Amino acid sequence: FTYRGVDLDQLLDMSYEQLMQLYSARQRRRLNRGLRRKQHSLLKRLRKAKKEAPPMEKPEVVKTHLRDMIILPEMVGSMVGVYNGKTFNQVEIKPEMIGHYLGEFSITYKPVKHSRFIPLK
Amino acid sequence: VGPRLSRRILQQARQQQEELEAERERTTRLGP
Amino acid sequence: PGVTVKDVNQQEFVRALAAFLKKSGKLKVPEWVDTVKLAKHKELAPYDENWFYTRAASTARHLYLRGGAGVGSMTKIYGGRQRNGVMPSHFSRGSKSVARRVLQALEGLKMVEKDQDGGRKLTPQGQRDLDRIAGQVAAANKKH
Amino acid sequence: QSVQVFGRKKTATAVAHCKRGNGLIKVNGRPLEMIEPRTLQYKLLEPVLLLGKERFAGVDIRVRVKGGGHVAQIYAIRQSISKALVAYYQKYVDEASKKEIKDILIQYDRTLLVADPRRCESKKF
Amino acid sequence: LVIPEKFQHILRVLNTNIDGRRKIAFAITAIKGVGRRYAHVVLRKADIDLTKRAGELTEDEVERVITIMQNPRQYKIPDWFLNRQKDVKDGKYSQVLANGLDNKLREDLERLKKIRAHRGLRHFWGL
Amino acid sequence: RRPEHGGPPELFYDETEARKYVRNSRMIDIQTRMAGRALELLYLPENKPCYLLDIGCGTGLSGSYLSDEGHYWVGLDISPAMLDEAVDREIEGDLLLGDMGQGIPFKPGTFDGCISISAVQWLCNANKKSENPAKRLYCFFASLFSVLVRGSRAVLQLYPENSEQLELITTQATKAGFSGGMVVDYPNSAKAKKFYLCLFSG
Amino acid sequence: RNKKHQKLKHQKEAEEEELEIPPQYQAGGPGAEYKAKKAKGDVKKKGRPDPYAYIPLN
Amino acid sequence: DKLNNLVLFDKATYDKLCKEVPNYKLITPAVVSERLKIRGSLARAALQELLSKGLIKLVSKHRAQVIYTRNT
Amino acid sequence: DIKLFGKWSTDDVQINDISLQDYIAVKEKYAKYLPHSAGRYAAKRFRKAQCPIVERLTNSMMMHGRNNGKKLMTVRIVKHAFEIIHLLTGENPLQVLVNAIINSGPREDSTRIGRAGTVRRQAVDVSPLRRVNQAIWLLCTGAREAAFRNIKTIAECLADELINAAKGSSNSYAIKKKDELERVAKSNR
RNA sequence: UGUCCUACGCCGGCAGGCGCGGGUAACCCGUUGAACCCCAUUCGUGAUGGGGAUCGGGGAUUGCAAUUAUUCCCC
Ligand SMILES: Nc1ncnc2c1ncn2[C@@H]1O[C@H](CSCC[C@H](N)C(=O)O)[C@@H](O)[C@H]1O
């Protein structure tokens, strides 16, 4: 795997201020406006859930409503169940999921899935 | 004619008369 | 008795003035003179690859006719109709960078100078140069 | 001696000033063979082509035009020019000459001395 | 004028048939991945007259046009002028024309499918 | 406003009109669609190659549909240009340049069914002085009744401009021996207002 | 105003048919359930097939 | 059917136009295009080419319509 | 002398039909430099008969949507068509237009009448003003339907339509429409 | 119509940024340099330089928040 020519290890080493130079324009604008208290809270929660995970299989489920959360490179490998309005959907955090919001991975609507008269006399 | 058209015509005629009549540092020191 | 710019056909004036400015060779042509659309409502690049000379000549003529104009006035003047897809068309101004570059190049020719009341206007060099080339065009057209 | 008249179309208004001269005829500082639409060029020269250049040989007229569109501006120009000539031959030249001039101007085109009373209608609630 | 003796009616450029009985700035546009504007700038960067027809170019001008086409950045073609500016896997300013566009669209849709985002799932439910 | 109001059908549908007819994309779609409902409304023997009569074939649009269904047919048209372009489309069924109001020239009891798409509204307007709307309609309907195998249904898609048109058509049909009625599929719907005079001969 | 136009256009259709009927007897021998209240149009039903209109000939 | 007007001059077409065009009593890009099977740009360019040799008389010129005639 | 377009003489123009003399206004009182006059010619009945007939043709070229109001375009078309007509036939295009209108006007037409279901055609005569109107309208329609998708300019097709209608040949759209209208009116006496 | 309308200068190719002024108004935008139109160039009857939808990538702006594309720009 590589993202904009940059591998995951130095992505985790990559700083917050010039992480915006590989992200997109909406992405860069959002990171310039700064993450609020809920996003930092869920960052701490994900880091804690990754903390006491046993080192052989994936950590436990973290459930949230934060659909406007962006996937950051530190989240890669977390088990996040995001709300769609009715239920929670659990998703892997893959390395190539970096540029997309969390709310894209829990669709809030179901797809739409939708005898002639003949006279005898 | 009516108000607006006559007003524009009067301004045009006044400006034309002025620019036919047409064809330095202000006096900081009062004395000659 | 001297023939004035206002007494001369304007399109032949612009053509001869562009030829004169290309002949002088003192215009500062930008590097991106090839790779730019002149406004956002355009679709293709101009076919006339010496478009900078014609635009500078037109700008000099416009500043002769009505001075005190800045960059925004030049963007209004060469603005046009944008066809907005399947939406109704609208009016969109010209690109500000092209107006700024033609104004600064004509200023670097000593052809155009700033004024206290606003943007750019003509130099006396500019006025008599336009009068001389207008005399040339009037001789080439009215006397023939 | 000099006069000043006006002519008009829907919203295009022209003011013509008429003075003694040699036959230099100007609108906005430009000759009448330079006003932008050549397709209506003969609409500009109609008093010239009817009345002859000899009757224009001793007069200078300067017209300032504002408002309207291209066609309306041309019509205001020709109306102002014809009214200026009529006014000059009324005030300072004999009456009878103004009579045949005003006549021939009427039976060619009646609008050359009177404005057209047509304008855009309003919309009501 | 008249026909030259070396007029090529159909050119084979990037596995694409090019009708020689067309202007060069639009015969290049006939290639996928090249529009009117990009064809105009690549022909102006090659110093080639745009009044001149496509079908009777010599081989040297055709090869120089192609070398500008797969190498825009080396010939002062600006960075903002390209199709794929910041490629998601390996960020480099590029211009894919014939088969690269179809392929790179295919793995774009495949990446959208494999992460199960809304856009990929919706577009592959669309057919 | 209406093609029928223009005047004589032959003079109206000239070479220019014929060219524009096959060029019209709506014409193709709506006519094939109407011919589908026509073949369905008339109760033709199921799984049986039928023998229908195209009273108004024109460009052979309805005719080509019958050819695809495997039903052999014979065309009838007053427009020479339209029949020329129909044979240029190479339709399977035979054609015949004749007038409906004049009379269909076939043995009584020959055609099992008859397809008429937008052609009977032209018979209610006397384009000439000799032309008599009532008589023309009656004669056509009587001939059709006989020509049609006694019992087979003759679907008649029409575009009435008023009630007088429909009234005339219905009376001249019922008194000629034609029994049945009219199926107005989607009656409230205006873009789908399809009047089909279903007329069995028995 | 166009609604009354359309409605009694259909009424004149019906009356002219009903006045055709008696001389038809002498000299010789419609979407009501498919109307939508909320809107102009033609709504499908489940018990009955797609909308139609049968006016039999005598 | 589909028109197949030529984009550059063949030998026979060039010869017949150079010996037939200066007497039509009507010279216009459209008419020479439709009677010589020539695309309009090539017909236009041939027309100012023939005007350059003095064989063709211009009577009026416009951005939409330029019209010629024979010399004598 | 007053000449159209600075070139075109109106003294030799004659009308060969006595019906249309008072309704085709090309004479010394109606001789104008341009077909652009912007007069109030439809504010009262029969006023438009005194219009110059070139101006009527110019006003009737402004048809089908996009071309509405584009009168300078149509006077350009008229000027180029007159030049093409002169350079083709060698004779004054004003007489060509007058003859085309005369040969293009329907002299006998039909009227749709009806009582109940019986819709028929009754032959009636055509007034000279309506003769001029349908002649102009059919000439404009003939030119417009003639070009519309080919290399032929609107001016060339317009010139060809006036030339062939002045000759009375069957290739013109207006002549064919007049022939079929008169044939229907003759068959509906 | 306007305390958000904006003149002007600089940077960018464009969306757009920075600074410095005017306007609570026939005072400033604004002599409201609008579009059709006119002139000149290229295109030639070809679903084509007509037509622009739907899509891939990138940039910017408004907002706590733009994902199911707020909007704008370029290819
Ligand atoms: N009296 C008559 N006799 C024969 N054909 C007639 C007729 N009156 C009208 N028609 C025909 O009615 C046709 C109208 S169009 C019919 C074609 C049909 N819509 C289809 O494409 O399948 C014309 O082709 C015309 O020739």
Side-chain angles (χ1 to χ4, degrees), chain C residues 44-62:
Chain C
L44 306 189
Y47 319 114
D48 175 338
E49 61 86 19
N50 296 115
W51 67 263
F52 200 83
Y53 297 112
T54 73
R55 182 50 77 89
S58 178
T59 300
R61 200 192 63 90
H62 272 278

Side-chain angles (χ1 to χ4, degrees), chain A residues 2-5 21-23 28 96-97 100 104-105 107 109 111 113, chain E residues 86-91 111-112 114-119 121-122 125:
Chain A
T2 177
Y3 173 61
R4 317 276 207 207
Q21 295 298 109
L22 286 196
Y23 277 167
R28 175 177 318 125
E96 68 275 16
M97 293 176 70
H100 309 76
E104 322 199 5
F105 305 102
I107 310 171
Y109 67 101
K113 288 168 76 173
Chain E
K86 276 164 65 179
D87 185 323
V88 65
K89 66 184 289 184
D90 50 354
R111 186 273 303 278
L112 278 188
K114 182 174 71 68
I115 62 163
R116 286 177 276 275
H118 174 241
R119 271 205 278 140
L121 287 178
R122 195 196 158 78
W125 180 287

Side-chain angles (χ1 to χ4, degrees), chain F residues 9 13 21 31 55-62 76-79 82 98-101 117-119 122-123:
Chain F
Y13 285 120
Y21 195 88
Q31 252 90 245
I55 257 320
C57 49
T59 90
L61 250 163
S62 306
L76 215 116
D77 226 48
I78 211 39
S79 172
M82 231 117 142
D99 195 271
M100 295 152 39
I117 299 288
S118 55
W122 299 83
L123 266 200

Side-chain angles (χ1 to χ4, degrees), chain D residues 9 37 39-43 45-46 49-50 71 75 107-109 111 116-118, chain I residues 2-7 29 31-34 36-41 72 75-76:
Chain D
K9 191 69 177 177
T39 61
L40 294 175
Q41 175 182 351
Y42 279 137
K43 299 304 282 172
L45 302 180
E46 262 167 353
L49 294 174
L50 307 190
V71 182
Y75 280 16
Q107 70 273 15
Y108 181 84
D109 186 74
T111 60
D116 189 358
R118 292 193 284 177
Chain I
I2 297 174
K3 282 192 193 185
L4 185 74
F5 291 155
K7 181 67 174 66
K29 193 174 180 65
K32 303 287 176 177
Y33 291 161
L34 280 176
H36 197 291
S37 172
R40 299 179 68 186
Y41 282 24
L72 299 194
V75 309
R76 200 260 324 286

Side-chain angles (χ1 to χ4, degrees), chain I residues 27-57:
Chain I
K27 206 57 69 178
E28 72 273 15
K29 193 174 180 65
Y30 306 106
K32 303 287 176 177
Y33 291 161
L34 280 176
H36 197 291
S37 172
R40 299 179 68 186
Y41 282 24
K44 186 180 289 293
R45 198 179 191 213
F46 291 109
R47 187 88 74 78
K48 67 213 209 188
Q50 321 159 5
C51 186
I53 208 63
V54 179
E55 180 146 6
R56 304 206 72 206
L57 183 63

Side-chain angles (χ1 to χ4, degrees), chain F:
Chain F
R1 277 148 180 166
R2 283 289 185 115
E4 172 222 303
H5 288 164
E10 353 85 31
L11 249 196
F12 179 75
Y13 285 120
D14 67 301
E15 204 53 81
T16 304
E17 223 78 76
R19 254 108 242 243
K20 269 298 271 249
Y21 195 88
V22 282
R23 273 299 251 186
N24 184 23
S25 297
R26 179 66 179 192
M27 257 8 152
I28 312 290
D29 218 9
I30 197 57
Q31 252 90 245
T32 314
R33 252 123 40 138
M34 278 186 300
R37 197 45 177 130
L39 205 47
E40 190 172 35
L41 267 183
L42 114 94
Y43 211 28
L44 91 125
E46 292 97 88
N47 316 103
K48 177 252 186 158
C50 236
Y51 190 39
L52 316 139
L53 165 73
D54 231 308
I55 257 320
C57 49
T59 90
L61 250 163
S62 306
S64 260
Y65 174 69
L66 313 176
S67 302
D68 127 86
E69 303 274 287
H71 309 327
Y72 308 89
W73 54 276
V74 168
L76 215 116
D77 226 48
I78 211 39
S79 172
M82 231 117 142
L83 265 208
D84 297 330
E85 92 184 335
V87 93
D88 293 334
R89 237 174 99 188
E90 316 293 327
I91 48 201
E92 167 203 71
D94 217 345
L95 297 169
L96 187 74
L97 228 148
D99 195 271
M100 295 152 39
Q102 241 160 67
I104 305 111
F106 270 88
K107 266 152 234 220
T110 272
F111 287 108
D112 204 73
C114 155
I115 304 273
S116 168
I117 299 288
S118 55
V120 86
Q121 66 267 348
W122 299 83
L123 266 200
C124 334
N125 31 288
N127 312 109
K128 302 301 136 226
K129 277 320 200 64
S130 61
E131 256 183 75
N132 188 274
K135 250 128 261 155
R136 279 316 246 195
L137 276 160
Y138 198 81
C139 176
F140 155 68
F141 279 127
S143 189
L144 199 49
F145 164 72
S146 223
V147 163
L148 265 241
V149 176
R150 251 38 114 263
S152 59
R153 202 165 309 155
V155 54
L156 193 96
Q157 157 69 37
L158 71 133
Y159 276 118
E161 35 128 350
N162 38 48
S163 197
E164 318 279 344
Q165 267 223 339
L166 248 179
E167 169 237 80
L168 251 193
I169 293 163
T170 55
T171 353
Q172 306 311 290
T174 186
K175 293 159 127 294
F178 259 147
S179 184
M182 181 189 27
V183 188
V184 196
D185 285 297
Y186 272 83
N188 322 90
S189 282
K191 211 184 96 136
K193 224 153 32 86
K194 290 317 150 247
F195 302 76
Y196 295 91
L197 232 86
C198 269
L199 288 174
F200 50 81
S201 34

